[PDB]
């Protein structure tokens with residue numbers, strides 16, 4: 001595509017993100033890399049309260065401003081959720097609060113671990129001269145041992161890389177519509193469908209590397225935020241930045257541009273209506289990087305691929321379009337079954353509005369089939 | 372460009388349609404005699420006796436904007452009735468279905484919206500005269516003595532005064548990239564000139580609106596059903612949705628030209644998770660699609676604010692500040708209007724309203740070039 005910071009190889013992810021900061025900031029990363037055994041010992045909160053306020057004026061490139069936001073975001077999650085059994089810190093220490101916020105609002109992100117931090121900037125290749133498989137990859141940061149966070153972040157990133165392969169044929173879709181290149185558009189839409197289809201096969205790998213009683217009971221709590229949470233009723237205080245507490249939702253895959261872009265490409269207005277789902281997905285855009293909003297906004301301001309394919313009466317076109325929407329329905333319906341496996345049944349051993357929420361998005365997707 | 376802009380009237384609808392196809396005479400009669408039907412108590416009767424008219428005989432965009440305006444005023448008149456408290460909670464099928472079908476086609480919620488009752492609700496008496504209050508009028512009003520002509524036309528007149536600055540928005544972004552310091556100064560000054568002229572047109576609101584008529588009559592018919600005690604969980608659109616849906620009443624926050632200058636001047640009115648940032652973002656779902664595409668696409672370009680901040684140019688900075696100073700004066704003068712037309716009439720039988728508008732103005736003066 002364009003300078004929207006989209007890689008041809010990994011798409012919206014950060015290509016080969018940085019693992020080490022300037023040693024100026026080694027006080028920070030010492031904490032982050034040893035979080036699994038700093039939380040167990042009741043000494044993570046104390047060592048955070050010890051650190052003195054470092055300045056953000058020495059983050060040179062963009063790749064280490066991201067790495068900094070990941071470290072500062074992972075510490076912030078570990079500090080406020082503690083061991084994970086209902087002990088909550090409602091005020092973030094001053095000497096890490098204002099470094100987190102000063103950086104965050106220079107990348108136009110909210111001061112909390114978002115999807116682009118802990119997934120897109122949170123990976124590396126085992127052998128740098130090797131492909132992109134679950135074997136040859138490893139996550140840079142985890143919360144506590146045995147939380148399956150390496151499985152969760154990676155297979156989510158792997159299908160992100162899988163679907164993002166279709167991003168570089170989006171410009172083909174829009175210009176085939178402009179020059180009336182029917183055959184090109186048809187092949188373009190078919191290629192998009194093959195990517196969303198194989199992004200579902202990569203999505204099967206979650207049964208192998210994430211365990212339900214693990215995800216629900218440890219990794220869920222560290223990825224929660226302080227927006228509409230009874231544990232942090234009025235939000236979290238960023239000491240020294242805002243005197244009042246600020247609310248921010250936790251990390252979500254709805255904060256991925258790849259996963260929202262195909263809905264606006266195919267003309268599925270998932271943001272239309274006053275529904276809680278249409279509202280959530282819109283709010284989650286301000287939790288995406290700025291170049292990633294501008295890409296979704298630019299897709300919105302293009303002629304509807306749907307209404308174009310609708311007007312042609314082309315049974316070939318209308319099947320290639322229906323192929324893409326069937327791939328999103330299958331993904332969302334298979335995604336519904338794992339929510340039964342990884343939230344519903346673990347919670348058994350309120351929560352019914354979650355399935356309604358997701359079924360709302362699936363139904364709107366499935367109500368966009370042409371024929 | 373293609374954002375459906377007008378050289379003279381801007382984001383307003385250029386010379387809207389005054390009549391619909393005689394197929395829809397059943398609708399047009401109810402809208403054109405809205406005060407008489409409500410005054411006699413026979414409006415809800417003639418709406419229930421309506422047959423379902425297919426929206427298919429509405430081809431032109433202008434004939435669809437007129438129908439949205441007609442159906443919207445009838446809808447507002449049906450729900451509120453006499454406006455004294457006896458509200459209807461179910462919108463009859465024979466108007467709810469054509470309403471929602473048309474709203475779907477135009478990507479707007481099924482409720483009366485600024486783009487209907489201001490941008491599409493006006494007429495030029497003499498085509499050879501200028502766009503002045505004595506040359507213009509409205510198409511549809513709610514009650515007798517509701518001062519609908521004043522409120523809508525003063526707003527529409529202000530919208531045109533500010534839209535005269537939209538044509539130099541590409542000049543500002545052209546000059547920033549080609550590094551043309553002179554024309555960027557001239558362009559910024561021209562923007563500040565138009566905004567200060569809009570404040571002068573805004574003064575007419577004292578002449579054609581009176582506080583009692585607005586607060587007691589017109590304000591009622593603009594109220595929606597989102598977060599309202601009288602319609603707890605929305606409105607029934609019979610035959611189109613099994614469940615009631617919530618939607619917000621009309622607001623000038625639904626106007627793009629009033630949100631765009633904040634976006635242009637780098638004044639992030641939408642950053643953070645505050646109520647004000649949320650409300651203004653929520654209102655973009657109430658603007659025409661091409662109008663809300665223009666807002667976020669302005670967010671894509673490099674920020675005019677940080678560019679002026681780097682150039683250490685007492686000329687540039689004084690010109691950039693002049694625009695921000697014009698917004699702060701418009702927003703502060705608007706607060707004197709609110710207390711006259713809402714707060715004071717409330718005191719002859721509120722705060723969260725003021726604290727929103729104070730927060731929005733406070734965010735603008737934070738953008739004054741001293742930080």
Ligand code: HEM
Nearest residue numbers: 155156157159160215252253254259332338339342343361
């Ligand atoms: C244990 C595994 C998973 C669980 C329990 C789960 C659960 C959920 C929940 C609760 C939501 C509601 C929105 C929110 O609360 O953030 C959601 C939405 C969503 N999830 Fe997941 N999820 C899982 C794995 C994944 C993965 C691996 C992906 C993609 C790589 C994904 C993609 C999405 C998307 C795109 C949405 C937005 C709604 C939509 O697009 O239909 N999920 N999921």
Ligand code: HEM
Nearest residue numbers: 525526529585621622623624629702708709712713724731
């Ligand atoms: C009787 C006269 C008026 C009253 C009582 C009034 C009241 C209000 C209210 C209640 C809001 C908050 C938004 C909402 O609650 O929906 C608001 C905001 C706003 N008003 Fe008005 N209004 C009046 C006239 C006007 C006019 C003629 C304009 C024309 C430009 C205008 C421009 C705006 C704008 C742009 C906002 C959005 C907030 C902002 O941009 O700062 N108002 N006003």
Ligand SMILES: Nc1ccc(Cl)cc1-c1ncn[nH]1
Nearest residue numbers: 115119156223251252253254
């Ligand atoms: N796949 C994910 C990866 C990272 C984060 Cl922070 C959240 C998710 C997710 N949110 C909803 N479902 N899955």
Ligand SMILES: Nc1ccc(Cl)cc1-c1ncn[nH]1
Nearest residue numbers: 163258259260262331332335
């Ligand atoms: N919308 C989605 C919902 C759930 C899952 Cl698992 C994936 C997607 C998606 N994949 C590509 N685009 N969107």
Ligand SMILES: Nc1ccc(Cl)cc1-c1ncn[nH]1
Nearest residue numbers: 484485489526593621622623
């Ligand atoms: N000026 C307006 C014109 C039409 C409608 Cl529906 C609302 C407003 C307004 N809302 C808040 N302030 N002004």
Ligand SMILES: Nc1ccc(Cl)cc1-c1ncn[nH]1
Nearest residue numbers: 533569628629632701702705
């Ligand atoms: N932001 C505003 C708030 C209140 C009023 Cl009355 C006008 C404006 C405005 N006019 C042109 N741009 N902005």
